[PDB]
Amino acid sequence: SGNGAQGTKFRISLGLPVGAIMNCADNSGARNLYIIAVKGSGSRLNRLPAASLGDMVMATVKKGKPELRKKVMPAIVVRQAKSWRRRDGVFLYFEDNAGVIANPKGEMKGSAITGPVGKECADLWPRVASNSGVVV
Amino acid sequence: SQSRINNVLNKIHVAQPQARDDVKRTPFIPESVKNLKKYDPEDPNRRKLARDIEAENGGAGVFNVNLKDKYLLEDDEWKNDIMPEILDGKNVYDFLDPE
Amino acid sequence: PQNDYIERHIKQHGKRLDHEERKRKREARESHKISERAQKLTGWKGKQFAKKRYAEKVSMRKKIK
Amino acid sequence: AKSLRASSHLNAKSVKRRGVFQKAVDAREQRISDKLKEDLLKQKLE
Amino acid sequence: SHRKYEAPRHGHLGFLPRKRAASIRARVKAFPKDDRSKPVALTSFLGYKAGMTTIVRDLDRPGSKFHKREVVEAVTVVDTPPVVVVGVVGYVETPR
Amino acid sequence: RDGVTIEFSTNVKDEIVLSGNSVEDVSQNAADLQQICRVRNKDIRKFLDGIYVSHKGFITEDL
Amino acid sequence: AREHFEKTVAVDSVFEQNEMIDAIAVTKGHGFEGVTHRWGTKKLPRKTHRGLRKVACIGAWHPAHVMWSVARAGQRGYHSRTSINHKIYRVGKGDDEANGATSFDRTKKTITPMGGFVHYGEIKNDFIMVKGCIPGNRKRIVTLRKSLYTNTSRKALEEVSLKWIDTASKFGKGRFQTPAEKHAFMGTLKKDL
Amino acid sequence: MATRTQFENSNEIGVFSKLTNTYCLVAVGGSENFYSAFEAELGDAIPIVHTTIAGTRIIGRMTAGNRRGLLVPTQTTDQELQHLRNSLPDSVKIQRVEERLSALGNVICCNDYVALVHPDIDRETEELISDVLGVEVFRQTISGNILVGSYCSLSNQGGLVHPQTSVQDQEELSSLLQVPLVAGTVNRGSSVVGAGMVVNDYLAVTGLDTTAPELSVIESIFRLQDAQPESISGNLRDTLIETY
Amino acid sequence: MRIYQCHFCSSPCYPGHGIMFVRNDAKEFRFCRSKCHKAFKQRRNPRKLKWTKAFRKAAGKELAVDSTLTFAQRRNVPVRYNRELVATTLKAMARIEEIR
Amino acid sequence: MQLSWKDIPTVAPANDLLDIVLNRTQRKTPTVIRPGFKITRIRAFYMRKVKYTGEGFVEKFEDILKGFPNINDVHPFHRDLMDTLYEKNHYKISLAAISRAKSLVEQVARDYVRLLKFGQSLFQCKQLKRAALGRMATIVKKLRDPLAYLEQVRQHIGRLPSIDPNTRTLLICGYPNVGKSSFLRCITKSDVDVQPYAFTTKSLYVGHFDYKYLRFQAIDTPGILDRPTEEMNNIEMQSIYAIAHLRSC
Ligand SMILES: [Mg+2]
Ligand SMILES: [Zn+2]
C-alpha cells in the first residue's frame, strides 16, 4: 500500500531487508542502491522492514556518480531474486536483485531501464512499463 | 532576452516533409467513422452507454462484464462455447490448424 | 473564498433555513446545562469550572456595581 | 478503520441482505430440497 | 515500568485451555437458525479428509486486479460416503 | 409511526405534511426525519441543505 | 425422519456447487511442545543459561504467582476448531466416470492422484471439493456444516468453474496426470517387450 | 476531436490502450468507464475489444501495430490471442513475436506506412514487422532515447517527438517518417509522450491533466480538427512564446 | 492453460509445479522439479545426462524424428476457433498419439 | 510560502494557550510521586515536567514563527498590501514579541533545569517546578494582546485572494458604482456584489478566465478617489498599490 501506485498490490515474498544492496537498473548513472527504508512496511517489534518486487523504497546511492551520493532517494524495485508464487501458478526468481531510483510521485528518472523487469513491477507503475524495454 | 527564443524554436519549428521521394501516405479514415453520429449526453436517443449498462447492473462493483458475445464468430450459436485448451497433454492450441 | 465570502453567503440566505430556533433552544438549555456541568463534573475539571464560575460572578458583581 | 462490530457496517450489510444475498440462499435451499426429494424417490423406487 | 515497547501478545487467550480434544470427532456447538418455512434439509454432513490437490480456474470477481484471469488455488478433497439415518433425538426447551 | 399519515403538501413545492392524532408520534417522526438527513464533516454555515420543520399547526385549520 | 429411516442421503441432497460450508475438525497432534513453537515466542539469543527455547521470565515480583496468560509450554495440536467460509469448488459423484473431467481439460481421469492419495485409499464415492486447507490431516473425520447465516459475500456468491483438476501423484514429484501419459512419454519399457 | 480521458487513476492513456485506425484495445481491469470513454467517441464504427497481455494492465506498452496487423509479446497466453483474433476483423493480421524484447509497445512504434524500432532488435523481428504491417522499417533513436515507442507518438497525420529532441533529430525523423513532427509535451509536461496518449487519424485520447496549449499543439500536429491542418502553429506563435 | 516441456528433460511442466529461472538474457528456463533446477544451477549439460530426454534424442533412439511430431509445433497462427475444427482436432490428437 | 497562507497554525489567545499547555503537561507527563522516592527520582520527575512544559511552549511559539508569511522579502505587492492591511510595523512587532517570549521561556526552562539538580528535598524541587511554570505563565500573560492580534490577522490574511504577479493580469479601475464590479462579474465566473451603493467592494477581487489558450485573471479593485495622495484610506491605497505593482493593461 503506497501512494502513486496504480491499483492495489498483491502480496509476494519479501527479499530486500533494509540495508540490502541492489544493482542499478537504469541509465541514471548510479552503480548500486543501498536501501534504508521501505514505504508501507509493516511495523513490528524486532522485525526488520523488508521490500519486494515493485515496491517503492528509499535508498542511498552506495556507488555511482558522486553527485547522486550522500542523499537518499525513493526507488522502485525491478527485481527481487527471491522466489515468489505468481497467481498464474509457477514460481520464478530474477538472476539478481535490481531496482531504480525515482521521485516520490513515481515518475521515472532515467530514460530507460536496463535488463528484464518483473511483470508485477511494470503492472504497478505505468511509467516503469513505459521505461522498461523488456518485460520479463 | 535574446536567449529564450533559441530554446522555444525547437518546439515552434515544425518539420517539413523532406520529400525523400514520396510513396502515397493518405490517411485511412473508415467510412463508418464518417457516418457515425456525434454522441450527445443530453440526447435521449444516445447510445446505450456500456457505462450506463454497468450502472444499471448494480454498478461497477458488482457488474460482471462479459468478454463473450462482443467478439465476431462464424455463428452466434457457439459464441458461448468453451474451448478445451488441453487434451491428454500437448495443449490443443499446438494442434489447432486449418486443413 | 478570497473575501468575506461566508458573510456574503450568510447575507444571501443566512446560516440555515431554521438557524434561529435551534440557537434559542440551545440558549434556553444552557441554563440547565450549567448546573449539570456543576454537578456531574468530576476530577480537576470541576475545580476549574467552579473557579471560572466564581470569577464570572465576581466580574458580574463588579459590572453591576 | 470501521470495527467489525460497528453498527453502521452491520446495518448496511443487513440492508444489502434483503436482495440477491437472500434470493441466492433461497434458490439454493430450494434446489437442495429438490435433490433430497429426488434421492428419496430413487431409494423408494427400489 | 511500561516494558518500553508495546507489542501484540503471543497466542490467543480465547482458545485456552489448549488441552487435547475429548474425542477425535469434534461435536458441533451451534446450528443455523431454524426457518420453519424453508423445506427440511440436513444442517450438516459427516465426512473424511482425503488430501489436498491443486486446482486452477478463471476468476469472476469484477473490480479485482486478477479479474478474468486464471488463479491457481488449493482445495481439500474430502471422502464423503453417503450417510444413512438410523434414529432421531428430540429436545425440549428448559430454563436450564 | 402508527397513526401518523404522511402526505406531501398540495400546491407547495418541496414540502411534506405529517399529521397524526398524537403529538408524540408526529413529533418523533419529524425528529427522526430531521435527524436522518443531518450533515457531517461539513460546515453548517455553508451547507443549508436538510429537512427542517416549517409548521406545527392543527389539522383544523381553521376550526 | 421416519420416512428417511434406513435410507441413505447423498451429499448432493445436502450441499451444492458454490455453497459455503464450515468444516470443523480436530487439529493434527504434535505432542508436548515448547513455547517457541506452540506460541511462537522468540528464541533467546544464544547459549543462554537454563536453556534458550523458553520464555526468559514468567512474571513480576508481584503477584507472587504465575499468570495463566504467560503461555507455558504444553500439549500442542489435537484441539477442536471451527473453520468457516470455505466455498465448495466441485461436488463430485462416485458413479460419474472421469470425475476430474472439466469443460476445458475434459480428460478421462479420476480426481484421485496417481498411486492413490498419500496415506489414504483411492476415492470410490461422492466427494466434496471444498477450497483451501481444513483442520486435521488425512483419515480424520470432518463434519461439514452450514455457515449459520446468510453471508452470500461476493467471494461466496461468485460462480466457480474449474479449468483443470491436477491429478499428478502426490507420492513424489509427480509429472504425468494419468498412467497412459506416462507410458506415452516414456514409451515401451524393456519389461513391456 | 481531442477528448480528455482518464484510467483508474493515471494520465498515461497509452499504457492502458493501443488505438488504431481500424481497431482499439483497452485493459479489462477496473470499471468500464475507460472502455465506455473510448466508445463515446469511436462509437460502434470500429471494434473496441477488451483484452489482456499476460494479465497486465500495461498491454498498450506490451504491443504495437497498425491497421494492417498487430503483434503481441511472446509471454501472452494463447487464450488472449484467440480472443483478440476472434474479436478483431480477419483483415487485422496477428502474429506472436519470439524476440527477447517483450515490450513491443515501447520497443516499437508505427503508423500505417512506417515503423521505427529499437536499434538492438534482431533482424527477424524487423522482417516479421515488415511482413505483417506492410510498413517500411527503419531502426532509429529519438536524440538518444533508445525507447522510441514511449517517446514518440505517431500517426499518418503526424507525430509528437519528446521535447528534448534536437532540431536536427526532428528534421531527420521528418525525412524518414514522411510525416510532420513537433516537439512538445503531454499530461502536464510529462516527457513520455508516446505512453501519455493514444492517437489515430481521427481521434486522440489524452489525460485530464494535459494543458490546453498542449492539446492545441497535439490537434495541430495531428490535424485532428477542422481548420487546423498543422498550418495554425504560426497563429500559436504568441501562445507558445507566452507559455515558455 | 499452457503446459511447457521441461527445459532440461523435456518432460511436461503442468501449472502450479516446477520453477522458472529468469536469466538476465530474458528467456525463461523452466524446470519441472527441483532436480532439473539444481542441475541447471550446476551448469550440467542435459545432453550428457543419460536420463534426459534430449540425450535420448541425440543418441539415435525413441524415434527422434517422425512425421507425427510435425503437429507439435508451437504455432503462432491465431486462426479462429470453430466447433467443427475443434472436434476434428480432438479426434486427430488421439489418432496422432496412437500412431506415434 | 506565498499564495494564500492558509496553513497558519490557528493561533489561540494567551489564556487558552497557557491553559492548553498546562493541561498537556499535566496529562502527558507522569504525575504521582512520593516523599519516600529517591531524591534523584523526584529530581528527574520535576526536570521532565519542566522540560515538557518548556518544549510545549517552544513548539507553540515556533509554529507561529514559522507559519506566518514573513512579509519582508516576499514581494513588493504583497508587502505593501499587508502593510496597508495589518499595519506592517505592528505585524512585525507582534511576531518579535512572540520570539522574545519564546526565548524567555527557553532561558527560564534552562536555568530551572540547571538549578533543579541541586534540590536536596522534595519541597524544594516542587517549589522550583512551580516557579518555572509560573514564570512561563507570566511570560505567556504578557503575550495576550499580540496573540489576539495575530489571531485576527490570521483570520484576515488566510482569506486574501491568491495572485502571482509574474502571471498575466489585467487591472480594472474607475469611479464607484461605475459597474466595474459588474464588468468583473461578466468577464469571469468570480462572484461579486453589484449593489447600487458606491463601494460595493471594500477589498480586491480576482477572477480567472481563459483566452487564446492562455490563463488570465481579471482583478477588480475597490474604487479610487481624486485626493492629494495623503487623504485616503487603506482601501484606496491598497487599490493604488495593486495598480502600481501590477503591469499588463
Ligand atoms: Mg459597485
Ligand atoms: Zn525436468
Curated annotation (Swiss-Prot), chain A:
Gene Ontology terms describing biological process: cytoplasmic translation
Residue list for modification N6,N6-dimethyllysine: K105, K109
Keyword line: Acetylation, Cytoplasm, Methylation, Ribonucleoprotein, Ribosomal protein
Gene Ontology cellular component list: cytosol; cytosolic large ribosomal subunit
Modified residues (N-acetylserine): S1
Pfam families (alphabetical): Ribosomal_L14 (PF00238)
Compartments (UniProt record): Cytoplasm
Record-linked CDD domains: Ribosomal_uL14
SUPFAM superfamilies found in the cross-reference section: Ribosomal protein L14
Function: Component of the ribosome, a large ribonucleoprotein complex responsible for the synthesis of proteins in the cell. The small ribosomal subunit (SSU) binds messenger RNAs (mRNAs) and translates the encoded message by selecting cognate aminoacyl-transfer RNA (tRNA) molecules. The large subunit (LSU) contains the ribosomal catalytic site termed the peptidyl transferase center (PTC), which catalyzes the formation of peptide bonds, thereby polymerizing the amino acids delivered by tRNAs into a polypeptide chain.
Extra remark beyond the main annotation: There are 2 genes for uL14 in yeast.
Name listed for the protein in its UniProt record: Large ribosomal subunit protein uL14A
Gene that specifies this protein: RPL23A
UniProtKB/Swiss-Prot annotation, chain B:
Membership in a protein family: Belongs to the TRAFAC class OBG-HflX-like GTPase superfamily. OBG GTPase family. NOG subfamily.
Remarks, miscellaneous: Present with 28000 molecules/cell in log phase SD medium.
UniProt-annotated location(s): Nucleus, Nucleolus
The gene coding this protein: NOG1
Protein name stated in the entry: Nucleolar GTP-binding protein 1
Primary role: Involved in the biogenesis of the 60S ribosomal subunit.
Residues of the full protein shown: 350 to 448 of 647
Subunit annotation: Associated with nucleolar and cytoplasmic pre-60S particles. Directly interacts with RLP24.
Swiss-Prot record, chain D:
Polar residues bias (residue ranges): 1-11
Protein family according to the UniProt entry: Belongs to the UPF0642 family.
Segment of the intact protein contained: 2 to 47 of 106
Region (Disordered): 1-20
Other facts noted in the record for this chain: Present with 6210 molecules/cell in log phase SD medium.
Protein name according to UniProt: UPF0642 protein YBL028C
From Swiss-Prot, chain F:
GO CC term, one of those recorded: cytosolic large ribosomal subunit
Main location: cytoplasm
Note: Present with 52400 molecules/cell in log phase SD medium.
One annotated GO molecular function: structural constituent of ribosome
Functional note: Component of the ribosome, a large ribonucleoprotein complex responsible for the synthesis of proteins in the cell. The small ribosomal subunit (SSU) binds messenger RNAs (mRNAs) and translates the encoded message by selecting cognate aminoacyl-transfer RNA (tRNA) molecules. The large subunit (LSU) contains the ribosomal catalytic site termed the peptidyl transferase center (PTC), which catalyzes the formation of peptide bonds, thereby polymerizing the amino acids delivered by tRNAs into a polypeptide chain.
Signal peptide segment: none
Entry's Gene Ontology BP terms: cytoplasmic translation
Domain of life of the organism encoding this protein: Eukaryota
Subcellular compartments: Cytoplasm
Keywords: Cytoplasm, Ribonucleoprotein, Ribosomal protein
Name recorded for this polypeptide: Large ribosomal subunit protein uL6A
Keyword Cytoplasm: yes
Organism: Saccharomyces cerevisiae (strain ATCC 204508 / S288c) (Baker's yeast)
Parent-protein start and end of this portion: 129 to 191 of 191
Family note: Belongs to the universal ribosomal protein uL6 family.
